[PDB]
Design goal:
Blueprint: H1 12-53, H2 61-121, H3 125-128, H4 134-150, H5 152-174, H6 177-223, H7 225-231, H8 234-286, H9 294-333, E1 356-362, E2 378-381, E3 386-390, H10 398-404, E4 412-416, H11 427-433, E5 434-437, H12 448-453, H13 461-470, H14 476-479, H15 497-510, E6 515-519, H16 527-540, E7 545-549, E8 561-564, E9 573-574, H17 576-582, H18 585-593, H19 606-614, H20 619-629, H21 631-647, H22 654-704, H23 718-758, H24 763-769, H25 772-809, H26 813-816, H27 820-867, H28 870-873, H29 882-919, E10 942-949, E11 960-963, E12 966-967, E13 972-977, H30 983-990, E14 998-1002, H31 1013-1016, H32 1034-1038, H33 1049-1059, H34 1062-1066, H35 1085-1098, E15 1103-1106, H36 1115-1128, E16 1133-1136, E17 1149-1154, E18 1157-1162, H37 1164-1169, H38 1173-1179
Parallel strand pairs: 3-7, 3-8, 5-6, 6-7, 13-16, 13-17, 15-16
Antiparallel strand pairs: 1-2, 1-4, 8-9, 10-11, 10-12, 10-14, 17-18
Helix pairs in contact: 1-2, 1-5, 1-9, 2-4, 2-5, 2-27, 4-9, 5-9, 6-8, 6-23, 8-22, 13-15, 15-16, 20-22, 20-23, 21-22, 21-29, 22-23, 23-29, 25-27, 33-35, 35-36
PDB class: membrane protein, transport protein
Keywords: ATP binding, membrane, membrane protein, transport protein
Assembly: monomeric
């Protein structure tokens, strides 16, 4: 029902070919096992020939007769085989792909036109609800999904079942046993893959849980970077970041260990079962003699038939996921629920006029539960008049304008155009009788000639000329170049807003409506252009019955009748003077109104260069991959010798050879492959493991040892930094993983295959490589053409989609209604191009897939043709033919594995490129010397001379210009300024966060410029507004080791004693040992600040710095901190920039800073005697 038939709906002749393509899809899938049925027949005769060939040791010439005759007879069959299937698979291929296009093309094009039509046909509803853009985004993405649902995926789907159902048919008939064995190994292979999902999902979360700690440390530190810098607690975070990494690596290696165990075991269970199938497959030959090895090979094709079920599932999933999403929204997509608008019939008034009448109208916006904006209405406007409506709370007047266009059917009451109800008349006609001027004008992207032409389709520039000329829009347009043919570029914002609306009036003027609706047209406009546009409105009035709502009372003065609302409730009506007489609602208002990343530059082999540098030794891992590489062909060699000697060899000794090789297929792989695979995994696993540490290590330390506008004023963010730590190390981990994988398969094919390739007849090789590269390139050129078609298609629908996206986003097209079909008209012509392009790719996709399979039979042809014939002509041998099959599976593991790790190499290369340029750093300040820390330097008299400063934004108008201060030791230097900066910056510059653009700063008289960075930050009393507490024991928080400083209990006691935080320390559990409880969630600001103060006086700085310490606080908290602060200072030099001027009254020197320029300075009473900024600061303090 709704699920399927509509998904496939219509397509009368389409449905017939839809079935034809379907039919062709079956016989395609049927062909592959039939091709393999042939493989057994050629095997059978060739085997009987081989049995007599080894059986001779007597006669020779006899073997030259019959054995070659059968082979010649087989050569006769060979020719009729590949062609019959080849010509078949060639034709049926081109057909089944036409299903993908020819059927899908006409269907989607049919879908598009109705969908694009139904959207505009829902009218009002889209404004009522949903997303109106996000909705139409996904929906057009949904119709894109449909082509995948009705395409050849289905053709492939029937093809798969034909290989499946048709495959098993042949299997059971030629035996019911082996099936059971093969069916038995199915859950086992599903069991091993089950181990995979358990290991991957479980080990991921552990790793995630591990790096979360490593991530969390980087999370707060990089957020706390300015805090840690000042205290120089870097090396501790340095050490910690290594510990979390130490654990995360151990979860990394075990994951790799267990994974390789699974993947190793996974292949074991396959090959064991593969071996198990033959041993029981062989035992039914030697002692039994039922199968000659035809079905034995053919039942393996049932696995190929079984793999097709795996190829079937996506097409169904492609079909199912497309179906459910489409048909459910299809109900919304298609039809026309409509029934408030429609397009058609209705009544056409020829009366060419009508008095507007509103009668007892109760209405509510379709917000449902929202209260009625309009409860009841009575308004009657006579013909030729102009009625004015007004309000306060908003809308409620605008509603009356909205109902008049029948955009919303009123809940109760009626709106009467002329004498008749509005619901009788044809809607299309009504919109044409109603001109509308909205407050916010809109111009479609087109010529000015066209925007008017959208008002009325049939018009000539003379009416256009007269329109704007009467609308006084004829001035700016003429001076403007291109005249009427001028396009409006980049949507509608180009020129002045007043001119846009004026044109909109002219557009509505062409409409020549007998009703004109103006909603706040004058509102939201510059004063000058307002009067200009108004005259046009004035010139558009008086000739037409109209109704106008705006908030400009200047335009309401000349109105014939005014009506008050204020929220939509009708109260007063009449002429202006009559209204002012009432001094009512009208009169009241009158007097009242009087995150992405990755810069371009690359690595260029520097990857393995830096990698090998950090990779001390691993030659056993890759060597283990090589011996594993060459191990792969041995299987292809062993199996080749099994059936080889089985095909060519006599009845004696058959048991031993097969027995000996059977065991050989096991031990060479099962014993060895598991070992080497787990052996390499333990190597390259740990290889990538330690790299993740050193890299993230040498980065975060390279990040922390550099600040300098990467931290202080970056364009980056915390998340972006963490992202770098995550992806880069993860990607380069993949970079190295791809290295061993390729080199492994390299020798697997190039190294060993060539050795095998060397023993051919040298022509067979050439013929083989006259196929494989050709079919590969043939497979490559298809992929290019495929995306080439995908890209060119997206561009075409884009232009159609944009102009489509243009319309739905503009809901005002429905008020004119002139453009309803007109837009869908352009879309038809726009949609017409991909249609022919859809027809074009039918031939293109048709010939490609056909050709791809055309090389398939041609491959088997030349394989067996030249394997027979000339080789059958002289010295027909069992070898070199199965070795061809060996060379094939190497080409399969080459393309498959290489192309898989190719993009892995890409994103890694890019991610590595970032991590390399970042780690280069610009270390700047770390240690050096620059000073000897003299014992006479304790002191503390801080100098500023000719200091200018700007934070690293160049044209930021620097906050410091010509600034100089001084403070003697052991006394308080007060500071006060307007707001913002120059307050805070001074404290920051003392930290030497940024070296000023000009001037100098001194502490003992020594130059800070030339002073050591560390020791300068060794004595500091820095306290911020909202102190950030690291999550840790408050005891470990109070004391942050400056350099060598151990956690000292007696000291932090003194810290708490002075900071008055000992109250909390006295009581409560664990006392000093209490953790902050997840980022200090159990403590208020007052508690935290006390601790920050304790951090300051732990250091015993000769210089204290208070940045708005009491800025955020209240009540007793303000006094207790001030009590601590005052007691913190007075023993040493201090600077308090706090905005509390009540507590600044005890200060040795108060300084008023005006934006880089110190204005006044002196003791409180001295400045108090003066007047200016400071006295104002106190005067406004009250």
């Amino acid at each position: 029902v709704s699920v399927l038939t509509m998904f496939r709906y219509a397509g009368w002749l389409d449905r017939l070919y839809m079935l034809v393509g379907t039919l062709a899809a079956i016989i395609h899938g049927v062909a592959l096992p039939l091709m393999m049925l042939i493989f057994g027949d050629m095997t059978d005769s060739f085997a009987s020939v081989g049995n007599v060939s080894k059986n001779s040791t007597n006669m020779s010439e006899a073997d030259k007769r019959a054995m070659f005759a059968k082979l010649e007879e087989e050569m006769t069959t060979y020719a009729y085989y590949y062609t019959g299937i080849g010509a078949g698979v060639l034709i049926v291929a081109y057909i089944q792909v036409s299903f993908w296009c020819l059927a899908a093309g006409r269907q989607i094009h049919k879908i598009r036109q109705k969908f694009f039509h139904a959207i505009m046909n829902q009218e009002i509803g889209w404004f009522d609800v949903h997303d109106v853009g996000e909705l139409n985004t996904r929906l057009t993405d949904d119709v894109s999904k449909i082509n995948e649902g009705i395409g050849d995926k289905i053709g492939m789907f029937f093809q798969a079942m034909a290989t499946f159902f048709g495959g098993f048919i042949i299997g059971f008939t030629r035996g019911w046993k082996l099936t059971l064995v093969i069916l038995a190994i199915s859950p086992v292979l599903g069991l091993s893959a089950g181990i995979w999902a358990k290991i991957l999902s479980s080990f991921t979360d552990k790793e995630l849980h591990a790096y979360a700690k490593a991530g969390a440390v980087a999370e707060e530190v990089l957020a706390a970077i300015r805090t840690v810098i000042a205290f120089g607690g870097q090396k501790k975070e340095l050490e910690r970041y290594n510990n979390n990494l130490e654990e995360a690596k151990r979860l990394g290696i075990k994951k790799a260990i267990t994974a390789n165990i699974s993947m190793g075991a996974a292949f074991l269970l396959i090959y064991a079962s593969y071996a198990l199938a033959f041993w029981y497959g062989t035992s039914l030959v030697i002692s039994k003699e039922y199968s000659i090895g035809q079905v034995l090979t053919v039942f393996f094709s049932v696995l190929i038939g079984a793999f097709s079920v795996g190829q079937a599932s996506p097409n169904i999933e492609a079909f199912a996921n497309a179906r459910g999403a489409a048909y459910e929204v299809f109900k919304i997509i298609d039809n026309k629920p409509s029934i408030d608008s429609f397009s058609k019939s209705g009544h056409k008034p020829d009366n060419i006029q009508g008095n507007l009448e509103f009668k007892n109208i109760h209405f509510s916006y379709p917000s449902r539960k929202e209260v009625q904006i309009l409860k009841g209405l009575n308004l009657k406007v006579k013909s030729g008049q102009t009625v004015a409506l007004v309000g306060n709370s908003g809308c409620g007047k605008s509603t009356t304008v909205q109902l008049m266009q029948r955009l919303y059917d009123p809940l109760d009451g009626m709106v009467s155009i002329d004498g008749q109800d509005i619901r009788t008349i044809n809607v299309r006609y009504l919109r044409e009788i109603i001109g509308v001027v909205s407050q916010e004008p809109v111009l479609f992207a087109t010529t000015i000639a066209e925007n008017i032409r959208y008002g009325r389709e049939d018009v000539t520039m003379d009416e256009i000329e007269k329109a704007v000329k009467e609308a006084n829009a004829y001035d700016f347009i003429m001076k403007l170049p291109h005249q009427f043919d001028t396009l409006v570029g980049e949507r509608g914002a180009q020129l002045s807003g007043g001119q846009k609306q004026r044109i909109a009036i002219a557009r509505a003027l062409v409409r020549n409506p007998k009703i004109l609706l103006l909603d706040e047209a004058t509102s939201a406009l510059d004063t000058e252009s307002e009067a200009v546009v108004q005259a046009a409105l004035d010139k558009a009035r008086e000739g037409r019955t109209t109704i106008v709502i705006a908030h400009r009372l200047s335009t309401v003065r000349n109105a014939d009748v005014i009506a008050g609302f204020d929220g939509g409730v009708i109260v007063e009506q009449g002429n202006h003077d009559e209204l002012m007489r009432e001094k009512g609602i009208y009169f009241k208002l009158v007097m009242t109104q009087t995150l992405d990343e990755d810069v371009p530059p690359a690595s260029f082999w520097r990857i393995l260069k830096l990698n090998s540098t950090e990779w001390p030794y691993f030659v056993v891992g890759i060597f283990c991959a090589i011996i594993n590489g060459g191990l792969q062909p041995a299987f292809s060699v062993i199996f080749s010798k099994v059936v080889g000697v089985f095909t060519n060899g006599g009845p004696p000794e058959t048991q031993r050879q097969n027995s000996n090789l059977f065991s050989l297929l096991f031990l060479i792989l099962g014993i060895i492959s598991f070992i080497t695979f787990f052996l390499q995994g333990f190597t390259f696993g740990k290889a990538g493991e330690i790299l993740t540490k050193r890299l993230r290590y040498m980065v975060f330390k390279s990040m922390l040892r550099q600040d300098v506008s990467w931290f202080d004023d970056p364009k980056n963010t915390t998340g972006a930094l963490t992202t770098r730590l995550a992806n880069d190390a993860a990607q380069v981990k993949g970079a190295t993983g791809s290295r061993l994988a390729v080199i492994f398969q390299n020798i697997a094919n190039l190294g060993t295959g060539i050795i095998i390739s060397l023993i051919y007849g040298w022509q067979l090789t050439l013929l083989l490589l006259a196929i494989v590269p050709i079919i590969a390139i043939a497979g490559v050129v298809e992929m290019k053409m495929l995306s080439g078609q995908a890209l060119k298609d997206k561009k075409e629908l884009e232009g159609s989609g944009k102009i489509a996206t243009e319309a739905i986003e503009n809901f005002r097209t429905v008020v004119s209604l002139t453009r309803e079909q007109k837009f869908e008209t352009m879309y038809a012509q726009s949609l017409q191009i991909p249609y022919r392009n859809a027809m074009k790719k039918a031939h293109v996709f048709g010939i490609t897939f056909s050709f791809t399979q055309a090389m398939m039979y041609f491959s088997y042809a030349a394989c067996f043709r030249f394997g027979a014939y000339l080789v059958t002509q002289q010295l027909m041998t069992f070898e070199n033919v199965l070795l061809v099959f060996s060379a094939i599976v190497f080409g399969a593991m080459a393309v498959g594995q290489v192309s898989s790790f190719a993009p892995d190499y890409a994103k890694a290369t890019v991610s590595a490129s970032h991590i390399i340029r970042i780690i280069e750093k610009t270390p700047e300040i770390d240690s050096y010397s620059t000073q000897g820390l003299k014992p006479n330097m304790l002191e503390g008299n801080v100098q500023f001379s000719g200091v200018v400063f700007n934070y690293p934004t160049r044209p930021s108008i620097p906050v410091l210009q010509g600034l100089s201060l001084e403070v003697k030791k052991g006394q308080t230097l007060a500071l006060v300024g307007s707001s913002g900066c120059g307050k805070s910056t001074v404290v920051q510059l003392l930290e030497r966060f940024y070296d000023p653009m000009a001037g100098s700063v001194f502490l003992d008289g020594k130059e800070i410029k030339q002073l050591n960075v560390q020791w300068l930050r060794a004595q500091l009393g820095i306290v911020s507004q909202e102190p950030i507490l690291f999550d840790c024991s408050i005891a470990e928080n109070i004391a942050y080791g400056d350099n060598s400083r151990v956690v000292s209990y007696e000291e932090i006691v003194r810290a708490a004693k002075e900071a008055n935080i000992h109250q909390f320390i006295d009581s409560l559990p664990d006392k000093y040992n209490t953790r902050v409880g997840d980022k200090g969630t159990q403590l208020s600001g007052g508690q935290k600040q006390r601790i920050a103060i304790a951090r300051a006086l732990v250091r015993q700085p000769h210089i204290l710095l208070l940045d708005e310490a009491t800025s955020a606080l209240d009540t007793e908290s303000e006094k207790v901190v001030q009590e601590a602060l005052d007691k913190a200072r007075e023993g040493r030099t201090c600077i308090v920039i706090a905005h509390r001027l009540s507590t600044i009254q005890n200060a040795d020197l108060i300084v008023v800073i005006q934006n880089g320029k110190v204005k006044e300075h002196g003791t409180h009473q001295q400045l108090l005697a003066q007047k200016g900024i400071y006295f104002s600061m106190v005067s406004v303090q009250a």
